[PDB]
Amino acid sequence: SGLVPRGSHMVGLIWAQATSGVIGRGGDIPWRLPEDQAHFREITMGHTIVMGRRTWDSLPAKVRPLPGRRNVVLSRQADFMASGAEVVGSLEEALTSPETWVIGGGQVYALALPYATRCEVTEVDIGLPREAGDALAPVLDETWRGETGEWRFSRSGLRYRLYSYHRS
Ligand SMILES: NC(=O)c1ccc[n+]([C@@H]2O[C@H](COP(=O)([O-])OP(=O)(O)OC[C@H]3O[C@@H](n4cnc5c(N)ncnc54)[C@H](OP(=O)(O)O)[C@@H]3O)[C@@H](O)[C@H]2O)c1
Ligand SMILES: CCc1nc(N)nc(N)c1OCCCOc1ccccc1CCC(N)=O
């Protein structure tokens, strides 16, 4: 199907996770998956994106701010320099755009989850176990519903699938 009705406010979370729920370590995403970059890009294009400061830090710098999207960086550092983005000091202000995609990281997903009505999740079939210091994906309960895509191979051979969850 791929349809998801929307209301006067849409707050979406988008992430890619290992089976174990690892999304981040050492300030990076511990795999590369071209189809997921393409998916992340097309979903978020033209929208406001919200990210924690550490996620802004983890962006390759030549791709800061992410092109074609309104970049919003959540930080408690009032003097934080984020060239080409805006810095907001609270989650409330961050989610004021009528359509917002939260693009990371572990901290901000957790805080934003209660307001979210879509989760766009790439499951990467990689057996990375949770380690000390890892950033972790939220656990979705059964208020979330939607569609699970088929397993696909990237040309590299890495296997992945897409979940598109929503709720009222
Ligand atoms: N696989 C994926 O889909 C994916 C996507 C995005 C990121 N990641 C990874 O996840 C990791 C980063 O995640 P993380 O959980 O460490 O950090 P994060 O959520 O990106 O950023 C946390 C920072 O956000 C700010 N913050 C958090 N809550 C706030 C609030 N209520 N008000 C104001 N500011 C707030 C603070 O910034 P200040 O310290 O500046 O105050 C905090 O240190 C990296 O490894 C990144 O590569 C993975
Ligand atoms: C594509 C990764 C990703 N994937 C999903 N599915 N949700 C996310 N929030 C998500 O994270 C978006 C923030 C980090 O983006 C990276 C990180 C490493 C390499 C590439 C990118 C894409 C953007 C760019 N031009 O660099």
The answer to whether residues 148 and 128 touch, using CB atoms and an 8 Å cutoff, is no
Closest ligand to 41 CA?
2
C-beta atoms surrounding 102 within 10 Å: 29
C-beta atoms surrounding 94 within 10 Å: 24
As a dihedral over the C-alpha atoms of residue 113, residue 21, residue 147, residue 154, rounded to 10 degrees, the angle is: 130
**Closest by alpha carbon to 66, among 81, 47, 80?**
47
Resolution for the entry shown, Å: 1.8
DSSP state of 37: H
**Reduced to 3 states, what is the DSSP secondary structure of residue 108?**
helix
CA 162 to ligand 2 centroid distance, Å: 15
**Reduced to 3 states, what is the DSSP secondary structure of residue 106?**
helix
Separation CA 91–CA 89 (nearest Å): 7
**Domain that includes residue 90, residue range:** 1-168
Count of the separate structural domains present in the chain:
1
Q: How was this structure determined?
A: X-ray
CA 69 to ligand 2 centroid distance, Å: 13
Separation CA 89–CA 74 (nearest Å): 6
Name every residue whose Cβ is closer than 8 Å to that of residue 95 and which is 6 or more positions away in sequence: 11, 50, 112, 115
Region of 59 (left: φ > 0; alpha: ψ -120 to 50; beta: rest) is beta
| 122 is an annotated ligand-binding site residue | yes
Strands 118-124 and 10-18, how do they pair?
A: parallel
* Ligand 2 atom closest to Cα of residue 51: 13
Ligand 2, pocket residues at CB < 6 Å: 14-16, 29, 36-37, 39-40, 55, 59-60, 63, 66, 103-104, 122
